[PDB]
From Swiss-Prot:
Function: Monacolin J acid methylbutanoyltransferase; part of the gene cluster that mediates the biosynthesis of lovastatin (also known as mevinolin, mevacor or monacolin K), a hypolipidemic inhibitor of (3S)-hydroxymethylglutaryl-coenzyme A (HMG-CoA) reductase (HMGR). The first step in the biosynthesis of lovastatin is the production of dihydromonacolin L acid by the lovastatin nonaketide synthase lovB and the trans-acting enoyl reductase lovC via condensation of one acetyl-CoA unit and 8 malonyl-CoA units. Dihydromonacolin L acid is released from lovB by the thioesterase lovG.
UniProt effect for mutating residue 338 to F: Strongly increases simvastatin synthase activity upon overexpression in E.coli
Source species: Aspergillus terreus
High-level lineage: Eukaryota, Fungi, Dikarya, Ascomycota, Pezizomycotina
Database matches in Pfam families: Beta-lactamase
Entry's family note: Belongs to the class-A beta-lactamase family.
Binding annotation for monacolin J: 85, 177, 192, 262, 392, 394
Protein name in the entry: Monacolin J acid methylbutanoyltransferase
Catalytic reaction(s) noted: monacolin J carboxylate + (S)-2-methylbutanoyl-[2-methylbutanoate polyketide synthase] = lovastatin carboxylate + holo-[2-methylbutanoate polyketide synthase]
Length: 416
């Protein structure tokens, strides 16, 4: 029956099991994350989801911020306030900074870059190599605009992603992030490149501030953020709490400490393409503000611009062909390998629902950062999410599958 003065509860095995409701999608998903840490498949992860109303405010942290044991022989935890390497997840931040410049009348999105970036405008385009093996450089056809930089349609490419630039370096021409030539004319094709390093310079020259100061005054201060910087070396408090980078060795699949240059040398320039260190918590504050249309970073109408397909049909088609054919690069992370996409300002836009009413909707904006960081904002679902790992290389199957599982679970329980 029931014990006097005691709350009625399960008193035998059948009634105890039934008194506990079965595990929903989110609980099962958290178990998968815990098992991945337990079995040493990942170092750790922070996953976060918010809606606009405040009824969804979900943050879970799993595992360690490193594989190196600390002074007490332990593996310290990855936390919501742990300083993490954002790498290309910096690009959303720089895009916002550019758009603020536009809002304040310092720049027009369709103005040529020649005025503020004459060093960019003077750069030639690498057409190829002659029979001898000499670089064939020529003058650009048309002008690069600010909007070309923001949409990666300027003709600029990262060296390692283009065969012309790889051979350009192989023949000793590059002996600098800004040095290599363009590989096409502006408007010709979508090409992932150093566009936000250039856009960052444009912000510095338009405002007379370095990007760090601009960042602090215009993104961090308005959101109460104190864990986001280009200058990690000058923040000893952040430096001591920071994540180490981990690398998965392609042979045995084991996790190893990754001793790479971005943690010892700040470098003197602020690079708008990859330079920011931020906690997951602070990055979510940016995403959430954009979701809320709260005017703290940008006017609602300007945020709406970021989610509009920027590409005319020819470029949309070319980008989708390139992305569908490039799952080895996989810009979209957990998104389906084949999907109709466009590019907005700040990321890739889904032009169709990912899985009907079960997952991200048409109009959602997304991108990633190198060490398996994935962010997305989905105005129709009323959700934004991030999955922060500190594990290289990009597109790690375990991280991608865990990230999918996370998003699926959150959408299944909390999408509205």
């Amino acid at each position: 029956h029931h014990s006097s003065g005691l709350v009625p509860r399960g008193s035998h095995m059948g009634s105890i099991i039934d008194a506990a409701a079965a595990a929903g999608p989110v609980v099962l998903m958290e178990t998968a994350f815990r098992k991945a840490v337990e079995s040493r498949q990942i170092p750790g992860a922070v996953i976060m989801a918010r809606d606009a109303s405040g009824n969804l405010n979900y943050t879970r942290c799993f595992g360690a911020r490193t594989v190196r044991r600390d002074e007490n022989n332990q593996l310290p935890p990855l936390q919501v306030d742990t300083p993490c390497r954002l790498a290309s997840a910096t690009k959303l931040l720089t895009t916002i900074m550019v758009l603020q410049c536009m809002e304040r009348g310092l720049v027009d999105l369709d103005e040529t870059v020649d005025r503020l970036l004459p060093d960019l405008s003077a750069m030639p385009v690498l057409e190829g190599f002659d029979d001898a093996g000499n670089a064939r450089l020529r003058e650009r056809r048309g002008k690069i605009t600010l909007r070309h930089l923001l949409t990666h349609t300027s003709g600029l490419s990262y060296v390692f992603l283009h065969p012309l630039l790889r051979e350009y370096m192989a023949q000793g021409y590059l002996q600098s992030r800004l040095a290599p030539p363009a590989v096409n004319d502006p408007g010709a094709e979508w090409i992932y490149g150093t566009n936000l390093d250039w856009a960052g310079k444009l912000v510095e020259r338009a405002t007379g501030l370095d990007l760090e100061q601009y960042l602090q005054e215009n993104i961090c201060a308005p959101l109460g953020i104190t864990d986001m910087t280009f200058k990690l070396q000058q923040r000893p408090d952040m430096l001591a709490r920071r994540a180490d980078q981990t690398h998965r060795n392609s042979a045995d699949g084991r996790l190893r400490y990754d001793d790479s240059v971005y943690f010892r040398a700040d470098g003197e320039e602020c690079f708008g393409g990859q330079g920011v260190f931020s906690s997951p918590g602070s990055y979510m504050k940016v995403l959430h503000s954009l979701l809320k249309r709260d005017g703290l970073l940008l006017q609602p109408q300007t945020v709406d611009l970021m989610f509009q397909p920027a590409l005319e049909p020819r470029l949309e088609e070319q980008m989708n062909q390139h992305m569908d054919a490039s799952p080895h690069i996989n810009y979209g992370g957990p998104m389906p390998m084949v999907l109709r996409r466009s590019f907005g300002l700040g990321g890739i836009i889904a032009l169709e629902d990912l899985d009907g009413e079960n997952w991200r909707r048409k109009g959602s904006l997304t991108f990633g950062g190198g060490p398996n960081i994935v962010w997305q904002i989905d105005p129709k679902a009323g959700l934004c999410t991030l999955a922060f790992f500190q594990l290289e290389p990009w597109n790690d199957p375990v991280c991608r599958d865990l990230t999918r599982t996370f998003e699926h679970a959150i959408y299944a329980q909390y999408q509205q």
